[PDB]
From Swiss-Prot:
SUPFAM superfamilies: Protein kinase-like (PK-like) (SSF56112). Its EC number is 2.7.11.24. GO terms for cellular component: cytoplasm; cytosol; extracellular region; ficolin-1-rich granule lumen; glutamatergic synapse; mitochondrion; nuclear speck; nucleoplasm. Dually phosphorylated on Thr-170 and Tyr-172 by the MAP2Ks MAP2K3/MKK3, MAP2K4/MKK4 and MAP2K6/MKK6 in response to inflammatory citokines, environmental stress or growth factors, which activates the enzyme. Dual phosphorylation can also be mediated by TAB1-mediated autophosphorylation. TCR engagement in T-cells also leads to Tyr-313 phosphorylation by ZAP70. Dephosphorylated and inactivated by DUPS1, DUSP10 and DUSP16. PPM1D also mediates dephosphorylation and inactivation of MAPK14. Acetylated at Lys-44 and Lys-143 by KAT2B and EP300. Acetylation at Lys-44 increases the affinity for ATP and enhances kinase activity. Lys-44 and Lys-143 are deacetylated by HDAC3. Changing residue 166 to A: Emulation of the active state. Increase in activity. This is Mitogen-activated protein kinase 14. The modification N6-acetyllysine is found at residues 44, 143. It is an enzyme of class 2 (transferase). GO terms for biological process: 3'-UTR-mediated mRNA stabilization; angiogenesis; apoptotic process; bone development; cartilage condensation; cell morphogenesis; cell surface receptor protein serine/threonine kinase signaling pathway; cell surface receptor signaling pathway. Changing residue 45 to R: Impairs MAP2K6/MKK6-dependent autophosphorylation. It comes from Homo sapiens. Changing residue 165 to A: No effect on either the kinase activity or tyrosine phosphorylation. Activated by cell stresses such as DNA damage, heat shock, osmotic shock, anisomycin and sodium arsenite, as well as pro-inflammatory stimuli such as bacterial lipopolysaccharide (LPS) and interleukin-1. Activation occurs through dual phosphorylation of Thr-170 and Tyr-172 by either of two dual specificity kinases, MAP2K3/MKK3 or MAP2K6/MKK6, and potentially also MAP2K4/MKK4, as well as by TAB1-mediated autophosphorylation. Residues 21-298 form the Protein kinase domain. The lineage of its organism: Eukaryota, Metazoa, Chordata, Craniata, Vertebrata.
Amino acid sequence: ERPTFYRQELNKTIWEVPERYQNLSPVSVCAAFDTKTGLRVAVKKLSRPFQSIIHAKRTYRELRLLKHMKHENVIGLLDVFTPARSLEEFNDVYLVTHLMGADLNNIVKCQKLTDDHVQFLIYQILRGLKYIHSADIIHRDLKPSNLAVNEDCELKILDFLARHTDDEMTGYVATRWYRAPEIMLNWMHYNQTVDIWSVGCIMAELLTGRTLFPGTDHIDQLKLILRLVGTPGAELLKKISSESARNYIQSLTQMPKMNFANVFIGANPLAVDLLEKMLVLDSDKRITAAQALAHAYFAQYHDPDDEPVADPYDQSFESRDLLIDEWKSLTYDEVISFVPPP
Ligand SMILES: C[C@@H](CS(C)(=O)=O)Nc1n[nH]c2nc(Oc3ccc(F)cc3F)ncc12
């Protein structure tokens, strides 16, 4: 049956939530206490979820994605609710997940982590990614700020969705530093391995305490990337479906791949080897999450029987054109059909 809701203004926003959620505090996301489960939770009220087709579809997309994700190392949905009693009244959507303490930045904080810390942290990211990728879902925007960790260094992947504007990808910004070159410059139709590029950047940063490719702009970042991994070979150049981008790439003086052991001085030789396998220019040749988990660097964490894959994820809706009310009705069904985890 329908729980009792109570009203409360917070972010100059009127929040109407079930009584079970108490002590709401702005952190449009609020920290709260779930009296039913005893969990500290984050409650997110979507703003204008059905204002346009694009926005309505995005609301549907986020809910579908969150409802599907059932893995230790991936953000899960604890609850989803609306104060509405019917489709006609339906206008607001609230999403509930675990309140995560801090992100990966707060932990790195300009400092080198121990090799054991790096092992454990990257292991969990790859474990989550294997899961995510097995459902043919690409994160597309993995960075330290989308990786939440608790006191015990237990990690969850957040975000996934919305996507950054051209303005916020411009200049000296962490929003672009972990992005694979093929997606940063739209070289081609990208695949799941864009995320592996991002993991390599993250891992290097955990090892050195420094951003791997802190480009001041797209062009500066590419030069930083190509200095490390070398300029593309003929094989890759053919794969760059963009004639314009291909032509610019060929304007650059050729450079060989650097010695990673000389770049990551003092680092575990197994970490160096993994980095070389993640940070490959040609995305076809990048190591996958499943393959990376079997790499000797994770010997003390790897367990083939404790690295689950996801149930199939039906994302046919992505290529579907619908009206606002149709995306809305679909979103409503998803809210109403939600079943809480054990
Ligand atoms: C405060 C923050 C610090 S942090 C980890 O981002 O640095 N911590 C968080 N823990 N959980 C979170 N969730 C969201 O957004 C949601 C996403 C999906 C939902 F179902 C519900 C949400 F509220 N935002 C932040 C956090």
